[PDB]
Amino acid sequence: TRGFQSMGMYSVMIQKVILHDVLKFLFVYIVFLLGFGVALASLIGSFSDAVLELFKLTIGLGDLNIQQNSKYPILFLFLLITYVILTFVLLLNMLIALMG
Amino acid sequence: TRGFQSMGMYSVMIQKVILHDVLKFLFVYIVFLLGFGVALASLIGSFSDAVLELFKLTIGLGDLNIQQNSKYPILFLFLLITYVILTFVLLLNMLIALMG
């Protein structure tokens, strides 16, 4: 698409955004994802099922009510809410940094 | 609505936004949509069902766990995650270009 100027200036901004800011957001989001996923898998489903459910909760799906082998679902509940609000404030910080 | 000044200035900005920036985002999003849809249909559901499921995943619906006739669902999984993160960075690039 380089050659179309009004699309090439749209194209090189994609390279500028993935090079600069979305990699930092991914680098913080992976360690928050592991720090919650190992926690929820230590609460006992498995590891790769809980991290997939966490990513489905991020993109906008996934039931959350009563998971199996919970000792106390109140702590599972507010751990999940703490993850969601931390992902929200991380997304907001990322978008205002790449606005800045 | 032209004649109401505080609504006519709201009205002509709709024409400015669809003329300038959302068409470029659609022009990149259609070729990403085809490049993932032909891929997922080559993994075998059909073509028009997989692209409809991809659009329902974009607007915020659609189950994603185990689709039929997958050779290996790990590659289907991270192809879907790669599509979702590419749509997210494309949306972010579009919104900061029309902020710019």
Of A6, A59, A99, the CB nearest to B84: A59
Length of chain A (residues): 100
Number of A–B residue contacts, CB under 8 Å: 35
Of B60, B61, B92, the CB nearest to A17: B92
* DSSP 8-class letter at B44: -
Q: How far apart are CA B52 and CA B88, in angstroms?
A: 18
Q: If you write DSSP's letter for every residue of A14-39 in order, what string do you get?
A: HHHHHHHTHHHHHHHHHHHHHHHHHH
Nearest CA in chain B to A63: B63
Q: How far apart are CA A73 and CA A26, in angstroms?
A: 29
Q: What angle do CA A85, A29, B97 make, to 5 degrees?
A: 90
Question: Can you tell me whether residue B21 is helix, strand or coil?
Answer: coil
Q: How far apart are CA A10 and CA B92, in angstroms?
A: 12
Instruction: Give binding residues of B as ranges.
Output: 60
Judged by CB atoms closer than 8 Å, whether chains meet at A17 and B96 is answered as yes
Instruction: Give binding residues of B for Na(+) as ranges.
Output: 60
Q: If you write DSSP's letter for every residue of chain A in order, what string do you get?
A: -TT-HHHHHHHHHHHHHHHHTHHHHHHHHHHHHHHHHHHHHHT---HHHHHHHHHHHHHT----S--TT-S-HHHHHHHHHHHHHHHHHHHHHHHHHHH-
* DSSP 8-class letter at B6: H
* Contacts by residues B65-68 (CB-CB < 8 Å, ≥ 24 positions apart): B68/B44
* Per-residue b or e along B12-25, where b marks 16 or more CB atoms closer than 10 Å to that residue's CB: eeeeeeeeebeebb
Structure tokens at A57: 């909760």
3-state DSSP: chain B helix, strand, coil percent, rounded to 5? 75, 0, 25
Q: How far apart are CA A87 and CA A64, in angstroms?
A: 17
Q: How was this structure obtained?
A: cryo-EM
Nearest alpha-carbon partner for B86 in B58, B51, B64, B46? B58
Q: How far apart are CA A84 and CA B46, in angstroms?
A: 35
Is residue B67 within 8 A of residue B45, CB to CB? The reply is: yes
Other C-beta atoms within 10 Å of A12: how many? Answer: 11
Amino acid at A7: M
**CA quadruple A58, A63, A69, A70: dihedral, nearest 10:** 70
How far does the CA of residue A39 sit from the closest CA of chain B (Å)? Answer: 23
Is residue B37 within 8 A of residue B51, CB to CB? The reply is: yes
Structure tokens at A63: 């039931």
Is residue A82 within 8 A of residue A42, CB to CB? The reply is: no
